[PDB]
Write an enzyme that holds these catalytic residues in place. Structure first.
Site, PDB file in Angstrom:
ATOM      1  N   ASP A 109       0.839  -1.199   0.032  1.00  0.00           N
ATOM      2  CA  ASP A 109       0.000  -0.003  -0.012  1.00  0.00           C
ATOM      3  C   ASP A 109       0.891   1.200   0.044  1.00  0.00           C
ATOM      4  O   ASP A 109       1.458   1.387   0.773  1.00  0.00           O
ATOM      5  CB  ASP A 109      -0.726  -0.035   1.344  1.00  0.00           C
ATOM      6  CG  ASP A 109      -1.990  -1.288   1.092  1.00  0.00           C
ATOM      7  OD1 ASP A 109      -2.369  -1.651   0.428  1.00  0.00           O
ATOM      8  OD2 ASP A 109      -2.250  -1.796   2.408  1.00  0.00           O
ATOM      9  N   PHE A 184       0.920  -2.767 -16.921  1.00  0.00           N
ATOM     10  CA  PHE A 184       1.337  -1.611 -17.260  1.00  0.00           C
ATOM     11  C   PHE A 184       2.593  -1.325 -17.362  1.00  0.00           C
ATOM     12  O   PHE A 184       3.283  -0.355 -17.937  1.00  0.00           O
ATOM     13  CB  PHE A 184       0.263  -0.459 -16.578  1.00  0.00           C
ATOM     14  CG  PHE A 184      -1.082  -0.488 -16.295  1.00  0.00           C
ATOM     15  CD1 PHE A 184      -1.562  -0.899 -15.485  1.00  0.00           C
ATOM     16  CD2 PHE A 184      -1.960  -0.293 -17.647  1.00  0.00           C
ATOM     17  CE1 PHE A 184      -2.957  -0.781 -15.436  1.00  0.00           C
ATOM     18  CE2 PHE A 184      -3.118  -0.173 -17.698  1.00  0.00           C
ATOM     19  CZ  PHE A 184      -3.735  -0.556 -16.480  1.00  0.00           C
ATOM     20  N   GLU A 185       3.374  -2.281 -16.905  1.00  0.00           N
ATOM     21  CA  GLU A 185       4.746  -2.515 -16.864  1.00  0.00           C
ATOM     22  C   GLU A 185       5.482  -2.572 -18.421  1.00  0.00           C
ATOM     23  O   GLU A 185       5.182  -3.574 -18.807  1.00  0.00           O
ATOM     24  CB  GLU A 185       5.167  -3.427 -15.928  1.00  0.00           C
ATOM     25  CG  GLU A 185       6.746  -3.017 -15.421  1.00  0.00           C
ATOM     26  CD  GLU A 185       7.241  -3.854 -14.147  1.00  0.00           C
ATOM     27  OE1 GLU A 185       6.323  -4.597 -13.691  1.00  0.00           O
ATOM     28  OE2 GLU A 185       8.175  -3.805 -13.769  1.00  0.00           O
TER      29      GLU A 185
HETATM   30  N1  LIG Z   1      -0.392  -6.308   7.412  1.00  0.00           N
HETATM   31  C1  LIG Z   1      -0.494  -6.866   6.457  1.00  0.00           C
HETATM   32  N2  LIG Z   1      -0.426  -8.284   6.353  1.00  0.00           N
HETATM   33  C2  LIG Z   1      -0.882  -9.104   5.135  1.00  0.00           C
HETATM   34  N3  LIG Z   1      -1.278  -8.180   4.182  1.00  0.00           N
HETATM   35  C3  LIG Z   1      -1.432  -6.940   4.064  1.00  0.00           C
HETATM   36  C4  LIG Z   1      -1.024  -6.202   5.255  1.00  0.00           C
HETATM   37  N4  LIG Z   1      -0.918  -4.717   4.976  1.00  0.00           N
HETATM   38  C5  LIG Z   1      -1.543  -4.957   3.730  1.00  0.00           C
HETATM   39  N5  LIG Z   1      -1.548  -6.068   3.254  1.00  0.00           N
HETATM   40  C6  LIG Z   1      -1.861  -6.164   1.749  1.00  0.00           C
HETATM   41  O1  LIG Z   1      -0.866  -5.827   0.982  1.00  0.00           O
HETATM   42  C7  LIG Z   1      -1.883  -5.814  -0.474  1.00  0.00           C
HETATM   43  C8  LIG Z   1      -1.037  -4.650  -1.380  1.00  0.00           C
HETATM   44  S1  LIG Z   1      -1.907  -4.545  -2.688  1.00  0.00           S
HETATM   45  C9  LIG Z   1      -0.620  -5.434  -3.703  1.00  0.00           C
HETATM   46  C10 LIG Z   1      -1.200  -6.875  -3.914  1.00  0.00           C
HETATM   47  C11 LIG Z   1      -0.251  -7.722  -4.698  1.00  0.00           C
HETATM   48  N6  LIG Z   1       1.236  -7.877  -4.365  1.00  0.00           N
HETATM   49  C12 LIG Z   1      -0.170  -7.265  -6.264  1.00  0.00           C
HETATM   50  O2  LIG Z   1       0.812  -6.710  -6.811  1.00  0.00           O
HETATM   51  O3  LIG Z   1      -1.319  -7.209  -7.154  1.00  0.00           O
HETATM   52  C13 LIG Z   1      -3.110  -5.715  -0.208  1.00  0.00           C
HETATM   53  O4  LIG Z   1      -3.632  -6.447  -0.672  1.00  0.00           O
HETATM   54  C14 LIG Z   1      -3.358  -5.586   1.254  1.00  0.00           C
HETATM   55  O5  LIG Z   1      -4.285  -6.190   1.810  1.00  0.00           O
END
Ligand SMILES: Nc1ncnc2c1ncn2[C@@H]1O[C@H](CSCC[C@H](N)C(=O)O)[C@@H](O)[C@H]1O
Length: 200
Positions: A109, A184-185
């Site tokens: 995130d 998109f990469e």
């Molecule tokens: N403390 C935590 N433990 C487990 N998952 C977490 C977390 N904090 C955030 N996340 C998760 O981290 C993800 C980041 S979004 C990216 C998701 C995936 N790696 C991709 O590239 O598509 C989200 O799904 C969110 O729920």
């Protein structure tokens, strides 16, 4: 239906007991952990390509866990387990020290707003925690598409004794085979990889 059907097979419940990887996976093999795997596309691709290795995913977003399970079942994987729980707590309570070959954190995130900067998972204590769970020579690999976060990640990781930057330019690395291209990469994605080395 994926959760109800496949959670009993590939899910791992949270507990305050350290995981026994040989017992969990039914063999002695390298373990890679992906934190926040989302829908699990990377994790399933990883596990499919590496049947000789074992994989654990952790994701708080339960629909993501379900999607990952559905895909893992579709590929007939036996070397993948998933958890639906805060990864920080899982690391503290369930992952043994020095046990992991690799930890992946892809597009965590980004929290664009300065007011949210502390919500970003890559901070010194978290990075230290991850380090303690890697075997020596094990790697923490993160990726982001937000440069301010990439720069923050680099600052955090560069400040920690026991992490060695694998970047030939002391910052970022090219995308390795172990992370899939995004739809998109520079090209707008930053990969960071640091190896665990003995404290200096
Ligand atoms: N403390 C935590 N433990 C487990 N998952 C977490 C977390 N904090 C955030 N996340 C998760 O981290 C993800 C980041 S979004 C990216 C998701 C995936 N790696 C991709 O590239 O598509 C989200 O799904 C969110 O729920």
């Amino acid at each position: 239906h994926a959760l109800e059907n496949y959670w009993p097979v590939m899910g791992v419940e949270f507990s305050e007991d350290m995981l026994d990887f040989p017992a969990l996976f039914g063999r002695e093999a390298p373990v890679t952990l992906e934190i926040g795997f989302g829908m699990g596309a990377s994790l399933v691709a990883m596990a499919k390509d590496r049947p000789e290795q074992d994989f654990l995913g952790i994701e708080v977003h339960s629909p993501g866990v379900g999607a990952c399970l559905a895909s893992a079942h579709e590929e007939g994987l036996s070397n993948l387990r998933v958890m639906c729980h805060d990864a920080v707590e899982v690391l503290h309570k369930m992952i043994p020290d020095n046990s992991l070959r690799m930890v992946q954190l892809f597009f965590p995130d980004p929290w664009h707003k300065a007011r949210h900067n502390k919500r970003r998972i890559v901070q010194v204590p978290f990075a230290e925690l991850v380090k303690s769970k890697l075997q020596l020579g094990g790697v923490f690999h993160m990726a982001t598409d937000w440069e301010p976060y990439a720069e923050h990640m680099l600052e955090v990781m560069s400040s920690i004794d026991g992490y060695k930057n694998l970047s030939e330019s002391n910052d970022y690395v090219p995308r390795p085979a172990s992370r899939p291209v995004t739809k998109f990469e520079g090209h707008g994605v930053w990969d960071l990889m640091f190896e665990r080395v003995k404290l200096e």
